[PDB]
RNA sequence: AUGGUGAA
RNA sequence: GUUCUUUGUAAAGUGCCUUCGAAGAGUCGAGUUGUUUAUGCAGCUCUAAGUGGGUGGUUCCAUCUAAAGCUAA
RNA sequence: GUUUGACCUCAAAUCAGGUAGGAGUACCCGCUGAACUCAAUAAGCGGAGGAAAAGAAACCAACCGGGAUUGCCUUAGUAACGCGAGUGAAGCGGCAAAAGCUCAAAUUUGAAAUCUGGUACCUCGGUGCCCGAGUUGUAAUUUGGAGAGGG
């Protein structure tokens, strides 16, 4: 029988809210290798012949995502359920709850990574966004963090 | 980093979560062959602190050894025998059973150009390190040899 | 065997971050690690071994 | 096996003593291969060992006494633009977001501008 | 049964190796400066003896850096400390004399 | 030596979070149950046999009292 | 005793 | 020595002011059972700490930071 | 939208790029180990090089501290043991040589900046292009001698 600390996944965000979260994340897809390379080539050509606002992108790497967490810099955290090493993500929801940061779980690590170029991403987070982020956070809260606040129970 | 938390989580092995994980993984390991390739290390923190890296050329193996010679050294030798072209740099525990013990072993390919082209691991390609586990030069082998620090006929011409 | 867990620690929220690491200038500077690649591409273009992007379109015969 | 082999000459005994002092042509000029390492060092007036030797036992040095950057084009243009905009007012240059994109401190600004002026008067 | 028949041969080989290192290491004295040390075991404390390398404190007091000292061929002992002012002063004077006597060619 | 190994708050937080998420091992469960049903002396005597060094058992038993007290408050 | 040899 | 290149708001060191500031777990350890020249290793139940821990001798002191690895002489 | 692709895993190749068997074995590294305490000897097993191994202290030290590892003399036929046959070292001291160090470990997040393979040029490799590995972590910056951010 699964312990109460396990099975927190599998029970994940609903269809509509998950789709909305995916759509919101698609608005800040990080520049891919080809796009970054072509942009750098264009910049070099412009400078070689004849100073920009800070960029924004989704956070995906586990190490730096956790680094942003604990510092309270993570506005939202999205976690995959089918990750093979469960211990990598067992403590992440607990850390997010302790730090007071919204968090959510999704089914399919590959689908999580498809919005961040990489084949798989395990977890994802956002640092900056326009205004639908607050509504999405409220929906995620009311649908998973407060409705299923009894995750500590059952087996 | 996640490793800072993963190490502490793995420290409390008797905890419910790790107890469930071990009993879940024991059946999967048993269903596998005696020696089989592992796509990724089940204990990434341990492997990473053991000098293993995810770059190309690194291979993780797993092997089952009967319980009841040092088990770690026997497992290393067994994996090296099948993996003739690989070098058994180190191995570590992952799971134990009543009748069998499971130890994960990380292998480094010396023939791969990636391993030879970096100065941090090119030393392993030298012929001196061939069959390192056979001579017990690994961490388990050195410990078994008793290479501790401290207390723990000749005739000249005149 | 079947008992619930206790959220004794997951009930209060920290205010100050766990670490007071100083803020690095790089976070406030336009990606010097990227200006390095930009200048490398500039050097390659100067050497003539890299074709400007415009010539790529102008030579699609 | 030696019986079969008898049924690749290499000479090196003499070449293992006549070692050339290739590490320094200056020393080689005054070096004497007929003397020992310690004798040669004493002849050249140079110490042979920093520690007390075991057991029993300066023109050359004069010939050894004789032996004893700018801004990048883009950086130079940027510094010239800053100097034209503000001159010597480093405080104003510090807050000049248009040109001080990297937020250079008051010290680095002057350190670069002095070198820029060195080649521009 | 080991017999040291090659004693003369071993001495000749050692001398040849020393001469070869002298040819390779002509400007330097082959060895590195080492500090003066007092032995333990009061049977031997009365007699001073050489050491492995100077402590970081001694190098700092001498007016140079650990890396610069190493490039100047000065032995460094990171794990050794100073407990007596006499030995520290002797090491400082030795380092000062060595620095005054040495001449370093340019990196060219 | 010039470094002992101060917790620096970061390790404190990490270990507390690990202890909370991982719960209590059967040894810790029994220790707390006997504290609530026997006493500190009984807990120490049980730890001295379950664990190795006497000082390590004493420190863990003392820490369990605080863990129970603070945990039951909230 | 070690390691091999063969036989109805 | 001879040379063609030297560069891009590129890299390093040092003293001053200031803020931050980690450490190899079924591992040490412990009991037993076999080996060892009364150290160590191995099988096995338990298996922990980080102003913590390992080795020693005097009323608790001296040194070091293990459970990863490379390295000519 | 009962169609689909991803991710994870399991198989196949007269596919491309790669490697281990065997021999020698004086020396070396581990397992096993017999008899006139004999002996951690011999034989047997597995693995390597020109040396092998060890190597930069959870070392020795009770001193007015030494300071990687290994060899010689000495310590010493002493400490210690079986006091009985026999076994039997180690610090310090002198000699030959000396070298340092690398990752886990704290955010590169204003840019996975990393690398294998295929292709066109000049070839113990370098450049452009394409794919793949990579985020379940590839480069620089930190390995306790601390170290990082800034002025």
Curated annotation (Swiss-Prot), chain A:
Keywords: Cytoplasm, Ribonucleoprotein, Ribosomal protein
GO BP annotation list: cytoplasmic translation; maturation of LSU-rRNA
Keyword Electron transport: no
One GO location term (cellular component): cytosolic large ribosomal subunit
Annotated GO MF terms: RNA binding; structural constituent of ribosome
Subcellular location: Cytoplasm
Subunit: Component of the large ribosomal subunit (LSU). Mature yeast ribosomes consist of a small (40S) and a large (60S) subunit. The 40S small subunit contains 1 molecule of ribosomal RNA (18S rRNA) and 33 different proteins (encoded by 57 genes). The large 60S subunit contains 3 rRNA molecules (25S, 5.8S and 5S rRNA) and 46 different proteins (encoded by 81 genes).
Entry similarity comment: Belongs to the eukaryotic ribosomal protein eL8 family.
Additional free-text comment from the UniProt record: Present with 238000 molecules/cell in log phase SD medium.
Function recorded in the entry: Component of the ribosome, a large ribonucleoprotein complex responsible for the synthesis of proteins in the cell. The small ribosomal subunit (SSU) binds messenger RNAs (mRNAs) and translates the encoded message by selecting cognate aminoacyl-transfer RNA (tRNA) molecules. The large subunit (LSU) contains the ribosomal catalytic site termed the peptidyl transferase center (PTC), which catalyzes the formation of peptide bonds, thereby polymerizing the amino acids delivered by tRNAs into a polypeptide chain.
Name of the protein in question: Large ribosomal subunit protein eL8A
Span within the parent record: 70 to 233 of 256
From Swiss-Prot, chain B:
Compartment annotation: Cytoplasm
Disordered: annotated segments: 137-152
PROSITE patterns recorded: RIBOSOMAL_L15E (PS01194)
Swiss-Prot/TrEMBL keywords: Cytoplasm, Ribonucleoprotein, Ribosomal protein
One Gene Ontology cellular component annotation held by this UniProt entry: cytosolic large ribosomal subunit
Pfam entry (one): Ribosomal_L15e
GO biological process: cytoplasmic translation
SMART domains reported for this sequence: Ribosomal_L15e
Biased composition (Basic residues): 142-152
GO-annotated molecular function: RNA binding; structural constituent of ribosome
Gene3D superfamilies assigned to the protein according to its UniProt record, in alphabetical order: Ribosomal protein l15e
Domain of life: Eukaryota
Family: Belongs to the eukaryotic ribosomal protein eL15 family.
Subunit structure and binding partners: Component of the large ribosomal subunit (LSU). Mature yeast ribosomes consist of a small (40S) and a large (60S) subunit. The 40S small subunit contains 1 molecule of ribosomal RNA (18S rRNA) and 33 different proteins (encoded by 57 genes). The large 60S subunit contains 3 rRNA molecules (25S, 5.8S and 5S rRNA) and 46 different proteins (encoded by 81 genes).
Note: There are 2 genes for eL15 in yeast.
Described function: Component of the ribosome, a large ribonucleoprotein complex responsible for the synthesis of proteins in the cell. The small ribosomal subunit (SSU) binds messenger RNAs (mRNAs) and translates the encoded message by selecting cognate aminoacyl-transfer RNA (tRNA) molecules. The large subunit (LSU) contains the ribosomal catalytic site termed the peptidyl transferase center (PTC), which catalyzes the formation of peptide bonds, thereby polymerizing the amino acids delivered by tRNAs into a polypeptide chain.
Gene: RPL15A
From Swiss-Prot, chain D:
Annotated positions of the Phosphoserine modification: 70, 72
Protein known as: Nucleolar protein 16
GO aspect biological process, one term: ribosomal large subunit biogenesis
One cellular component (GO) term of this entry: nucleus
Entries under InterPro entries matching the protein: Ribosome_biogenesis_Nop16 (IPR019002)
Record localization: Nucleus, Nucleolus
Protein family: Belongs to the NOP16 family.
Primary location class: nucleus
Quaternary structure, from the entry: Component of the pre-66S ribosomal particle. Interacts with NOP7, RRP1 and RRP15.
Pfam families linked to this entry: Nop16
Additional remark text: Present with 2860 molecules/cell in log phase SD medium.
Species of the source: Saccharomyces cerevisiae (strain ATCC 204508 / S288c) (Baker's yeast)
Residue spans of biased composition, Basic residues class: 1-6, 8-18
Renumbered residue ranges of the record's region Disordered: 1-21
Function: Involved in the biogenesis of the 60S ribosomal subunit.
Signal peptide location: none
Keywords: Nucleus, Phosphoprotein, Ribonucleoprotein, Ribosome biogenesis, rRNA processing
Curated annotation (Swiss-Prot), chain F:
Superkingdom of source: Eukaryota
One Gene Ontology cellular component: cytosol
Keyword Glycoprotein attached: no
Protein's UniProt keywords contain Cytoplasm: yes
UniProt keyword annotations, A-Z: Acetylation, Cytoplasm, Ribonucleoprotein, Ribosomal protein
Record GO biological process: cytoplasmic translation
Similarity remark: Belongs to the eukaryotic ribosomal protein eL36 family.
Subunit structure of this chain's protein: Component of the large ribosomal subunit (LSU). Mature yeast ribosomes consist of a small (40S) and a large (60S) subunit. The 40S small subunit contains 1 molecule of ribosomal RNA (18S rRNA) and 33 different proteins (encoded by 57 genes). The large 60S subunit contains 3 rRNA molecules (25S, 5.8S and 5S rRNA) and 46 different proteins (encoded by 81 genes).
Name recorded for this polypeptide: Large ribosomal subunit protein eL36A
Organism name: Saccharomyces cerevisiae (strain ATCC 204508 / S288c) (Baker's yeast)
Gene: RPL36A
Full-sequence range covered: 27 to 100 of 100
